[PDB]
């Protein structure tokens, strides 16, 4: 019973954790991409000049 | 001047070599950060 | 597992130190190449003269 | 000079994303262990 109870709780927590992680990852990725793009553009311009 | 142009080409190749070295260093730093996070998690689990 | 992870972390730190040394050597080579390019510009000015 | 700062920020973001991916892999391993423990707990309940 105790184990089951713990398991149940753990299960819920696990799910939540996963979701959170995913969200964070997504956000980070997006940000990174944007930054990279901007940088590239700037560099290109400079080079051209 | 032709020899200087050859040296400039060698310098341009060394620039790409340095860029590859910097990329490898960044990858190694990311791997070290991931390993440190995993080691902190394992240390917390071992303490518990 | 923690001893294995500590050995892996020590190996990764040694690899990072080797990569930093290689980056410093590449920076020294780039400085030598900049000096060679300055000498090449001086030689080109001498050739124009 | 802003290009170097942007590259450093992108590298820091990539390192944070790698740390988050390692944390997510650890969470997935923990979820698999929890599913195995739930199967074992169902067997123990029977």
From Swiss-Prot, chain A:
It is found in: Nucleus; Cytoplasm; Chromosome. Signal peptide: none annotated. Belongs to the SMC family. SMC2 subfamily. Central component of the condensin complex, a complex required for conversion of interphase chromatin into mitotic-like condense chromosomes. The condensin complex probably introduces positive supercoils into relaxed DNA in the presence of type I topoisomerases and converts nicked DNA into positive knotted forms in the presence of type II topoisomerases. The flexible SMC hinge domain, which separates the large intramolecular coiled coil regions, allows the heterodimerization with SMC4, forming a V-shaped heterodimer. Present with 3290 molecules/cell in log phase SD medium. Forms a heterodimer with SMC4. Component of the condensin complex, which contains the SMC2 and SMC4 heterodimer, and three non SMC subunits that probably regulate the complex: BRN1, YCS4 and YCG1/YCS5. This is Structural maintenance of chromosomes protein 2. The gene is SMC2. The chain holds residues 836 to 884 of 1170 of the full protein.
Curated annotation (Swiss-Prot), chain C:
It is found in: Nucleus; Cytoplasm; Chromosome. The flexible SMC hinge domain, which separates the large intramolecular coiled coil regions, allows the heterodimerization with SMC2, forming a V-shaped heterodimer. Present with 573 molecules/cell in log phase SD medium. Central component of the condensin complex, a complex required for conversion of interphase chromatin into mitotic-like condense chromosomes. The condensin complex probably introduces positive supercoils into relaxed DNA in the presence of type I topoisomerases and converts nicked DNA into positive knotted forms in the presence of type II topoisomerases. Belongs to the SMC family. SMC4 subfamily. Forms a heterodimer with SMC2. Component of the condensin complex, which contains the SMC2 and SMC4 heterodimer, and three non SMC subunits that probably regulate the complex: BRN1, YCS4 and YCG1/YCS5. This is Structural maintenance of chromosomes protein 4. The lineage of its organism: Eukaryota, Fungi, Dikarya, Ascomycota, Saccharomycotina. The chain holds residues 1028 to 1076 of 1418 of the full protein.
Swiss-Prot record, chain D:
Signal peptide: none annotated. It is found in: Nucleus; Cytoplasm; Chromosome. Belongs to the SMC family. SMC2 subfamily. Present with 3290 molecules/cell in log phase SD medium. The flexible SMC hinge domain, which separates the large intramolecular coiled coil regions, allows the heterodimerization with SMC4, forming a V-shaped heterodimer. Forms a heterodimer with SMC4. Component of the condensin complex, which contains the SMC2 and SMC4 heterodimer, and three non SMC subunits that probably regulate the complex: BRN1, YCS4 and YCG1/YCS5. Central component of the condensin complex, a complex required for conversion of interphase chromatin into mitotic-like condense chromosomes. The condensin complex probably introduces positive supercoils into relaxed DNA in the presence of type I topoisomerases and converts nicked DNA into positive knotted forms in the presence of type II topoisomerases. This is Structural maintenance of chromosomes protein 2. It comes from Saccharomyces cerevisiae (strain ATCC 204508 / S288c). The chain holds residues 299 to 344 of 1170 of the full protein.
